Symmetry: D2
Subunit: 390 residues, 4 copies
């Protein structure tokens, strides 16, 4: 009935076919796999890490909740138990579900989403892994340094992996972290927007990667008081504060993109990532730093409306229960040359505020009308203003 029940129902529906199969080493065996009509010929086994890593990144906050014996609590325990077995299989070289770690550049991407999952729920998803599994993750993450990343948002993947290694107490490469955060800052364009590399692209990679991962990296550096070369006293915290303020502005923009009937603009590449476009707004919500311009109720209501409208299309799922290539249903020609149905699991990134308890104000507060909904009703709605000075 309540918005939360819709969200947990959908998250469970997305997660369960992946995790139940992978928990017993049958993901590759059973997963109905689909590649772009313009697939560039790369090894199709990249699909499984895309699927698993992107999924776990998005549902890790949910699974970080304390255990209880409610219906939702039982689902969380089941998903988490499956996930823990899945993590073990993913790095066991003898498992049928051993992921493609050692070839291709793409694993850096999806390993960063795995790292995200551990950073978002360390006590629940990392700490319970056995020591052999932990050692395997450390080794698999470290060997990704073989990849020379594109000079784009991919720099954050390298930073995320090394940040995880740092936090896990393993040997890490600070240069990869520091070089990345410098470039991301250099790529800030203004009024909440970053360039995806040296040239500005009007697309949702600000949501898919840039702002959420930049904030996450800076948060770990700030929390550890990591000694960064030529950072004055307070400087890392100041960088984090600026990053958060920029993402707050981007969140205001994203909420104003949601139409009265729960749609949003479709532009830029990787439009098949569906509700992944809202990761910044979901992150602001989960971490409880929505700007004063946005109430929890309005954000929950707008995101729910968008989610219900998009996932009313049954053709988003195939017979096996896996996500298909598309946006609203099955639209395979929308898939870029680098896209497979594992890639689709980036849509899980909308679910971050499920990491707030069921009795948190985000979930229990009254529904509110979002900006465009008010506007087209002819009702008062707020003026918007640019944020410079960031």
């Amino acid at each position: 009935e309540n918005d939360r029940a819709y969200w947990t129902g959908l998250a469970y529906r997305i997660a369960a076919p992946v995790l139940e199969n992978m928990s017993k080493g049958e993901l590759k065996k059973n997963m109905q796999v689909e590649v772009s009509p313009t697939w560039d010929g790369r090894d199709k086994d990249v699909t499984y890490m895309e699927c698993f890593g992107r999924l776990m990144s998005g549902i890790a906050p949910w699974l970080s909740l304390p255990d209880d014996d409610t219906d939702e609590g039982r689902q969380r325990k089941q998903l988490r138990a499956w996930a823990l077995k899945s993590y073990a299989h993913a790095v066991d070289p003898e498992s049928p579900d051993y992921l493609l770690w050692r070839n291709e550049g793409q694993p850096l991407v999806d390993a960063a989403y795995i790292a995200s999952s551990f950073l978002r729920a360390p006590k629940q998803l990392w700490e319970p892994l056995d020591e052999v599994t932990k050692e395997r993750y450390i080794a698999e993450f470290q060997q990704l340094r073989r990849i020379d990343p594109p000079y784009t948002n991919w720099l954050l993947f390298s930073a995320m992996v090394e940040t995880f290694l740092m936090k896990a107490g393993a040997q890490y490469d600070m240069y990869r972290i520091h070089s990345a955060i410098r470039k991301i800052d250099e790529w800030y364009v203004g009024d909440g927007w970053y360039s995806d590399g040296e040239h500005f692209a009007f697309d949702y990679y600000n949501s898919y990667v840039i702002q959420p991962m930049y904030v996450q990296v800076l948060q770990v550096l700030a929390d550890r008081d990591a000694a960064l070369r030529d950072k004055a006293p307070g400087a890392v915290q100041k960088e984090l504060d600026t990053a958060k303020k920029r993402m707050q502005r981007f969140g205001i923009i994203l909420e104003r993109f949601i139409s009265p009937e729960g749609t949003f603009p479709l532009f830029g590449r990787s439009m098949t990532y569906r509700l992944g476009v809202f990761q910044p707004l979901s992150m602001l919500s989960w971490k409880e730093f929505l700007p004063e311009e946005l109430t929890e109720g309005q954000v929950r209501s707008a995101l729910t409306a968008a989610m219900k409208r998009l996932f009313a299309h049954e053709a988003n799922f195939n017979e096996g229960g896996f996500l298909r290539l598309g946006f609203a249903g099955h639209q395979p020609d929308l898939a870029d040359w680098y896209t497979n149905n594992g890639s689709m699991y980036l849509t899980s990134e909308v679910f971050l505020p499920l990491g707030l308890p069921a009795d948190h104000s985000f979930w229990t507060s009254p529904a509110e009308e979002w900006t465009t909904k008010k506007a087209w009703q002819g009702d008062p709605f707020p003026k918007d203003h640019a944020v410079r000075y960031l």
Copy 2:
């Protein structure tokens, strides 16, 4: 049933007629029900009338540039044009009750640029028929605006537009104002169809309200005249115009992808009270017939019509006198910025540019088509979008 044009001309007439009928007889200030922002900064309220008239004429000038005919629409065009010609004369006659506020404030540079836009968009129909005394008055009023030192923002284009008009009119003009402006606008291109409104990027619709339409219009006149600009070789101005057009084509693709299946669009940035003025680039691409291959005329007409019908279904957009009110969808006065009055609202006229294509043009007669988001949310095929990174 299937006549989008009739909806557009009906709305444009409804917006234009109360302004032009009153101003044609020097009674705009007498009769216009005027409204200022709740946070009005205290400037002289007479700025309202130039905002109203200038912004209106900019948007309907293409429509009124059509050849005369004796259809119902043709009769409306003749009536509007006759009123407009008398209005232009009153606007610069120092003895007219409707003499505009030319000589005080900075704001007149803004709205004079929209007047200049109207003359550049329909020179034969709106400029040439003015009597010689009126023309000389415009030239003098435009020239004295050089007293204004503009903000280092989109306002540079206002100065450029006025000077470009003066150049085209055969008057004394200041090439430095034109050239410095076009250099800055180019320097402010950020990428993938977007410019900064000055040195700092703002995510708002000023790319639509001012920057891209006026940049393209200035470059078009310079290219057409083969104007000798410092260190621009033969063909160099045309190359700048080609780039400007390509950037605006990309911005047009973005704007079409902003239109929701139910005819709404995102609301962000300042001056959201400009309503359908957000679509000026798409309307300009349509009118000047350089929509990129990604966009069909039918899909653009259909999407714009849907947005227009939905927004102007709100009766509260108009007051008792027939003038636009402060708001977006209806009367939402607190949306008005400190610099906004109900004359400012007439920038919504900038959607009407493709009315300058004849009624029997393919833009108007082609079958309706579904726009991008409408296809997408139906679960139907819709195109991949791609950044344009090379401009």
Copy 3:
């Protein structure tokens, strides 16, 4: 005997053939004129405004001094008397020495140097002109708005002319001033250096034009702001511009070798001691940074001046400057260069605008940086200024 006497002797030698001839409308008649071997074919009459304007810009501070009846005082009076008549001829359409105001783009350049002369000595060079002459200057300066300048240091020429018009109480174009100062600031590269337009060039146009004119324009704007309102942002801009020029001055002093030479790079190397205009301006306006003493600056500049102007071939038979650097080196002249252009070397003379009994002139000689260094003596570490 003293350094000052060398400087005034040279300034007089440079100035007198120009001003004596032009004062009686015989500059074009008598001036032995020389153009670049690669002269681009423009009207050669540009030469006379280049000569007169660049000269007056550089000697205006000297001639701004109060009168006295010393030998130097007599030279100042004579030069000023000739200059006043010359200014009148320059804008009288019936004079044989009427300058080329109305055609070409080059007049914007040299008109800016004329404007500089009036801004640097208004009471002595502008105010005594008769009303008809003043009206003619205002009209001639205003019609230069016909020129669409290169997107380079030339923006400052337009700014300088309009700044003069503003100061003179005439109709002026603030947009020309403001757009120029914005671009110049945008073209600051760092550590005292600006780009000459959108592309950095390693040359002395920072000295010839950019920093001295940027500072002068800002100073007038700041003085007008201060005469009103709460301190404006223009004061901060002027402060930054001065600090940048202080750093550039430190760099210029470190360019002077122990034997009074300096590096030769970039275009317009025929401008000779014009390379030192920022250092001369810092000295005249008394804001040398603490790193530089007046004595060391005077000593270094004198050494450079004596060595360069020991070459007799710098002057032709008529007493006019020739194309070259140290002597007659005509192939050094760019396609836009004539011997009138050479008078930009007058810009070294700015500290002659300080009285003969000022500390700049009376303080003990001091060793300059490289002179100390190559003696094996202590000399200061240099530091980048990265915060401007």
Copy 4:
């Protein structure tokens, strides 16, 4: 015979270092001096600064084939000492084991060691025994612990990894690629780069930036390294541009030399003496002087500057080591990070000794340099910006 002056000076600088280090007595015997404003770091950094900077500058000279001339005898002696020195430098049991494992400064001087190996691989790297080679590889690799300043130091990391790549060891392409991107981004124009995000008017363009950028790109181009999102020919184009920029900087440096063999003193680290001419020396050694510069004029100008600066006996201490200063002993000129080992960057002027004694660079007639012609009142060329790079 300009060459004999150069080899005499290079030998005088090199021999006290290499003879002592060859027998593990550099730390024992070297008369060491730190800045009056020394920041308190471990003074053992001095020895790697000394050895690495020395070897970088004389490596071209020592790359020449052996012969039976007087100079040939000196080269053989220096090279034999250097080979023993390289072995001691990485032997953890040697008294002269360098400070590899602590401080950030070792990244700097290890890059100069790597430079020496890249400049003379057959003569200085290949003859090292396999244990010594393995030790170098390990010592270079562990420098990845250092998070470099966002400055010219990025090239040190690139240089080390480039050496590792060329040596056939495990290398980090990310360190190389990120560095070359930043250096290109820091090009300001007309031959000048910024030392990091803010332009500094100083000679770090000479000490580090242009010579190391060109060297890194040259190895990448020669190997035909497949770099991320660099199309075929992209690396070659970057190398070509880098060389053209350094040609312009070389023209500028030649025009800095006064008629009496001085040059401007500006920016930090002015104690590096003739290290300011490394780009001009490199252009000469690698034979890509631009047409504006003849070998004769460059040799003559550099010789004049070198003779005038090293006429000051106080440049050397009693032990024969360089002292803190510029022209003599001027210790207050030393920055807080400077010791007398740092001074050995002045060896970077010697690169064209890597051209044989019978090469045109050495045998061509002396020519007058630009300022010398200018102040004589003689014709000299117009200079022009290169704005298109």
